[PDB]
Design a protein around this nucleic acid. Structure first.
Ligand code: CL
Ligand code: CL
Ligand code: CL
Ligand code: K
Ligand code: MG
Ligand code: MG
Ligand code: MG
Ligand code: MG
Ligand code: MG
Ligand code: MG
Ligand code: MG
Ligand code: MG
Ligand code: MG
Ligand code: MG
Ligand code: MG
Ligand code: MG
Ligand code: MG
Ligand code: MG
Ligand code: MG
Ligand code: MG
Ligand code: MG
Ligand code: MG
Ligand code: MG
Ligand code: NA
Ligand code: NA
Ligand code: NA
Ligand code: NA
Ligand code: NA
Ligand code: NA
Ligand code: NA
Ligand code: NA
Ligand code: NA
Ligand code: NA
Ligand code: NA
Ligand code: SR
Ligand code: SR
Ligand code: SR
Ligand code: SR
Ligand code: SR
Ligand code: SR
Ligand code: SR
Ligand code: SR
Ligand code: SR
Ligand code: SR
Lengths: 46, 237, 119, 194
RNA sequence: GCUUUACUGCAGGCUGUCGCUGAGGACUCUCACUCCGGGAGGAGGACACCGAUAGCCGGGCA
RNA sequence: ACUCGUACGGUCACUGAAUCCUGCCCAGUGCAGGUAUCUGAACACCUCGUACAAGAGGACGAAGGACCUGUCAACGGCGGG
RNA sequence: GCACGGAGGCGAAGAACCAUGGAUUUCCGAAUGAGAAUCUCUAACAAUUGCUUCGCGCAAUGAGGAACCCCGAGAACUGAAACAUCUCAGUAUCGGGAGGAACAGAAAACGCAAUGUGAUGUCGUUAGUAACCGCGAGUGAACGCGAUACAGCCCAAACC
């Protein structure tokens, strides 16, 4: 495929959202990333 | 039921359209103010996709290059004329009034100045019969006597490509190729061979129209199939 | 045009407007199709003018026949704005009536005559 | 005495006779070559316009509109219907042509509001109406004691809601008594049976 | 779903009539309107197209 | 749409290469043509009725039908004695 | 901030926090210079209008909103123990449009017929009455009365 600049920005975002909940959020909230996507198992928009 | 093929046609979808973007040009007579001082030279002979007949490219005095509905016997170099005074030779165009009776003509106008409507097919021709100050009588290819305005322009001679119909296609593949150059859906499936839902003649154990084929002129589209308002049928009598 | 049954010479028209121009400085004149219409109806009119470039024509179609059954003489003017200028208006005027001239009765008198003759 | 206006009026009582007959025969030729909505500097029927609220002032516009003559232009049912709902030919629409005309005019002049309209004839295949529209944003009108009412917010697009004279008549609102049980205060409020 | 001389209707076509629509059971004309022409102009013409209605046909469709 | 197409065209159908052939039937049904006479709606017209109107009847009568003709490589038929 | 971490910071120069008003407010979006799956290309009220100093100079429209409201388009399942008129229903759904509410509204009314009432909504009632209808199934008002709230005016023309 050929990605446009905008397409590329959205792909990047999705990639970033795919990171984990930082360790400290755990301690602070005294105890999951409900948006953990996989390139293979999932399918993004567009 | 479902609309029959004749009805699908009217929508003018791609399947039923002519390969227009592939067609060369409109072969209408040139427009002259008056005088007839219009002459050009046949610069080339070309094949016309839309009619399976040759057409001639002409270069006129004033610099107008245009394709023309060529009669039999026209070749490169030859000079053609178009006007009231134009000479009376094969390949020239002038109003019927100026044409001598008993002279085969082609690309005859229906209304003076339309550019030609009658006798344009391969090897055909109209026959100028009677002259007058009010009516020029022409005999068209179908054998019909047509009364026309003597002011209607035409081209002397018969259309090029005569005899085209004398040789058989021999095979489907040949029909195929010709059909692909026309606004026509081909091949043809018989009505009697379809389902009752697709045509008035469909249905039944064996194939056969379950009704007379001569249909009334007043029949609505969808029902007007078979022999339309036939005045008679068969070969007898 | 549908109400105009005769053409008035550019020169005759010239004399009339002039007569109308002095008619306002001296005598009395009416401006407007309505006021003109009432004068003819009241009979307080000597000569009425009717432009020929009136769109729509219904605004003045009645002037001709109304004047005839009232003996009041009438004359046509080519332009609408001229008639308005002659009547001393800053705008145009579809029709005008000279209600009792003034130091022009001599001409207005002749103008009427010249018209009758002009059929 | 009679107004000059009365004469225009009296002529239009029989548009088929007299001078008017000849004027129409001429005009319609030009009209037939005009568009669907042509703005005009002056009303063809002055008396009627003034009578309907017209005024020679800034913000007052008049436009002639033509519409195809006859009944509805309806498409036959593609799905099953009982004989009753199969009709196609003799069915007519519920809005009269004058109303269709007022709406087209108002669409052409989005910023203007329909004040009123009237007929100016027809031939065998179309009808013409002239429409008086007002510019609610022009100060010459915001100050007119006889027209400033049409400047209110609730008067916006009045024609599209039937607030016109032709609108109100066509909605069966003329009679104040017998026969208007299902028209007043609105067709919709009466279940749409009027 | 399909069929037809099943019942009842609806498109559609033919045909008469009224409006468009004018002048002098057959006729001429030109000015509306139509068509041909780049234009001038030519052809046709109160017909035709279109709106309305009436009779006939009408599994094409419900 | 067909159609930058014009009867050597293209639309609608039937049969299904070549070869040798393709009989009889137009009564019914279909299509088409004609039609003295018959039948055949509405508008306008006339009579009766109504101070008007509803309505009844009359005269005229288009396509259509009756009637006649053409037509089966048109639907189809080609038996019993 | 949700959010109870680590580090670090701010707050008596009165922070946090709350109310009111103001500042900032990327791109796409009615989306309006042209184009485009949120970007790009070379000065912009694009488009339709009114006014007009006739120059986009001054203005209007466009799109949104839970439903409510007004104007148009308008089914069928269903009921009638079938079904076609009828019914379901002017319902569902579709097109257009306004407001904080809409619409209606100062009699060419009513017609308890009168020596009577007196703009218009709406609520209660009048009443499943009158009326409609294969006179089947079903459909179905109004005047009046008791209430709520009340408010009446402006043009066209005549004459100027
Ligand atoms: Cl072929
Ligand atoms: Cl409006
Ligand atoms: Cl009362
Ligand atoms: K039903
Ligand atoms: Mg990573
Ligand atoms: Mg050509
Ligand atoms: Mg093809
Ligand atoms: Mg085949
Ligand atoms: Mg099969
Ligand atoms: Mg069938
Ligand atoms: Mg067979
Ligand atoms: Mg006043
Ligand atoms: Mg309400
Ligand atoms: Mg043309
Ligand atoms: Mg069926
Ligand atoms: Mg076979
Ligand atoms: Mg086979
Ligand atoms: Mg853009
Ligand atoms: Mg039932
Ligand atoms: Mg109903
Ligand atoms: Mg029953
Ligand atoms: Mg009901
Ligand atoms: Mg009542
Ligand atoms: Na994937
Ligand atoms: Na508007
Ligand atoms: Na089925
Ligand atoms: Na037979
Ligand atoms: Na903000
Ligand atoms: Na703007
Ligand atoms: Na501007
Ligand atoms: Na049942
Ligand atoms: Na059933
Ligand atoms: Na019923
Ligand atoms: Na009482
Ligand atoms: Sr996979
Ligand atoms: Sr051509
Ligand atoms: Sr041409
Ligand atoms: Sr069959
Ligand atoms: Sr034979
Ligand atoms: Sr002026
Ligand atoms: Sr709006
Ligand atoms: Sr064979
Ligand atoms: Sr026969
Ligand atoms: Sr009150």
């Amino acid at each position: 495929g050929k990605k446009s600049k905008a397409t590329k920005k959205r792909l990047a975002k999705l990639d970033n959202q795919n990171s984990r909940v930082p360790a400290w959020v755990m301690l602070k909230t005294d105890r999951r990333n409900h948006k953990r996507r996989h390139w293979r198992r999932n399918d993004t928009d567009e | 039921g479902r609309r029959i093929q004749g009805q699908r046609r009217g929508r003018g979808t791609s399947t039923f359209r002519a390969p227009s973007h592939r067609y060369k040009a409109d072969l209408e007579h040139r427009k002259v103010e008056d005088g007839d001082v219009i002459a050009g030279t046949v610069v080339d002979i070309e094949h016309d996709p839309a009619r399976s007949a040759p057409v001639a490219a002409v270069e006129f005095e004033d610099g107008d290059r245009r394709l023309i509905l060529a009669p039999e016997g026209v070749g490169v170099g030859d000079e053609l004329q178009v006007g009231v005074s134009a000479e009376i030779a094969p390949g020239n165009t002038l109003p019927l009034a100026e044409i001598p009776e008993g002279v085969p003509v082609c690309n005859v106008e229906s209304s003076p100045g339309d550019g030609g409507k009658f006798a344009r097919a391969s090897g055909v021709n109209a026959q100028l019969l009677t002259h007058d100050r009010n009516v020029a009588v022409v005999k068209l290819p179908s054998g019909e006597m047509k009364r026309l305005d003597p002011q209607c322009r035409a081209t002397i001679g018969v259309v090029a490509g005569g005899g085209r119909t004398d040789k058989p296609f021999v095979k489907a593949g040949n029909k195929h190729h010709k059909m692909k150059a026309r606004g026509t859906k081909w091949p043809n499936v018989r009505g009697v061979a379809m389902n009752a839902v697709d045509h008035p003649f469909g249905g039944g154990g064996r194939q056969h129209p379950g009704k007379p084929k001569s249909i009334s002129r007043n029949a609505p589209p969808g029902r007007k199939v078979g022999d339309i308002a036939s005045k008679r049928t068969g070969r007898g009598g | 045009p549908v109400y105009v049954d005769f053409d008035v010479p550019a020169d005759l028209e010239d004399d009339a407007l002039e007569a109308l121009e002095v008619a306002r400085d001296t005598g009395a004149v009416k401006k407007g199709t309505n006021e003109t219409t009432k004068s003819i109806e009241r009979g307080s009119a000597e000569l009425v003018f009717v432009a020929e470039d009136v769109q729509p024509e219904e605004i003045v179609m009645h002037i001709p026949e109304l004047a005839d059954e009232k003996g009041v003489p009438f004359i046509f003017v080519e332009q609408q704005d001229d008639l308005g200028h002659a009547a001393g208006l800053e705008v145009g005027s579809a029709a005008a009536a000279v209600t009792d001239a003034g130091e022009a009765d001599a001409d207005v008198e002749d103008i009427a005559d010249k018209v009758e003759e002009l059929r | 005495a009679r107004s000059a206006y009365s004469y225009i009026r009296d002529a239009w009582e029989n548009p088929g006779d007299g001078q008017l007959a000849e004027l129409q025969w001429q005009r319609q030729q030009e009209w037939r070559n005009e568009g669907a909505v042509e703005r005009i500097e002056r009303p063809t029927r002055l008396d009627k316009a003034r009578s309907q609220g017209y005024k020679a002032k800034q913000g007052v516009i008049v436009a002639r509109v033509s519409v195809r003559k006859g009944s509805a232009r309806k498409r036959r049912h593609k799905a099953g219907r009982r004989s009753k709902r199969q009709g196609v030919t003799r069915i007519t629409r519920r809005k009269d042509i004058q109303r269709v005309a007022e709406e087209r005019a108002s669409r052409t002049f989005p910023n203007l509001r329909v004040l009123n309209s009237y007929s100016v004839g027809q031939d065998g295949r179309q009808k013409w109406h002239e429409v008086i529209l007002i510019d609610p944003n022009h100060p010459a009108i915001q100050n007119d004691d006889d027209l400033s009412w049409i400047c209110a917010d609730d008067q916006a697009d009045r024609v599209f809601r039937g607030l016109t004279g032709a609108g109100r008549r066509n909605r069966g609102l003329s009679g104040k008594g017998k026969g208007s049980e299902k028209t007043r205060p609105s067709l919709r409020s009466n279940g749409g049976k009027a």
